[PDB]
Design a protein around this ligand. Structure first.
Ligand SMILES: CCC(=O)CCC(=O)N[C@@H](Cc1ccccc1)[C@H](O)CN(C[C@@H](C)CC)S(=O)(=O)c1ccc(OC)cc1
Lengths: 99, 99
C-alpha cells in the first residue's frame, strides 16, 4: 500500500498468532514491542530513545506479518510507549519513503 | 525521490542560517529539533518516547526547507539527541510510506 501521514501509520501485525497494532516508525532502527510473552531464548539489551535508555529483551528470528507482508527478524520487548516497527523489519517488507 | 531504509533516513534541512541533518520520521507526530535559540514566542511542553519525557519549547509557524521542499509549521526545540522531522511537516513535502 501507499500510506500518507496525516494520521499515524498504525498497522495490524500478526506475531505468535496474536494481532496487535504497531506504528511504522522510520526513525526507529529497531522493532520494539510492549511487554508480551514470546517463545525461546532472549538476551538482555539496552536501547536509547528521546527520553533516555531502557532495558529490553532481544528475541531473534521472530516471524511477524506486517500488513500482510512477511518478516523474520529481531524483536525487542520492553517499556516502549507504543509498539513500533523499525527499519530492521521495514526493509524486509520493502518499505520506502517517497515524496 | 525514494529513500530506502537500509540506513537512517537523514536529510539536510534548513532553518534560518542553520543547516542540519534530520530524520524523516513517520513515528514522530511532531518535529523536534536540537537546542537552538530561535526568535519569537514559544510555549513549554513535554514529549515522551523511549526512556521517558523531555522538556521542549514549542514554536509555531517556523519555515523549514527539507531537501528543497518548502514547509512551515510547529517545531519543538529541546535536548533531543537527533533532529526529527515529524508528520506535521512530512505531509507538507508530500512524503508517503510505500511497500
Ligand atoms: C538509534 C536510536 C533509535 O533508533 C531509537 C528509536 C526511537 O526512539 N526513535 C524515535 C526518533 C529518535 C531517533 C533517535 C534518537 C531519539 C529519537 C521515534 O521515531 C519517534 N519517537 C516516538 C516513538 C517512540 C513513538 C512513541 S520520539 O520519542 O522521538 C517522538 C515522540 C513524540 C513526538 O512528537 C509529539 C516526536 C518524536
Amino acid at each position: 500500500p501507499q500510506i500518507t501521514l496525516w494520521k499515524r501509520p498504525l498497522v495490524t501485525i500478526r506475531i505468535g498468532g496474536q494481532l496487535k497494532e504497531a506504528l511504522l516508525d522510520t526513525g526507529a532502527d529497531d522493532t520494539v514491542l510492549e511487554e508480551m510473552n514470546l517463545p525461546g531464548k532472549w538476551k538482555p539489551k539496552m536501547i536509547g530513545g528521546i527520553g533516555g535508555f531502557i532495558k529490553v529483551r532481544q528475541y531473534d528470528q521472530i516471524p511477524i506479518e506486517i500488513c500482510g507482508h512477511k518478516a523474520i527478524g529481531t524483536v525487542l520487548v520492553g517499556p516502549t510507549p507504543v509498539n513500533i516497527i523499525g527499519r530492521n523489519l521495514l526493509t524486509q517488507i520493502g518499505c520506502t519513503l517517497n515524496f
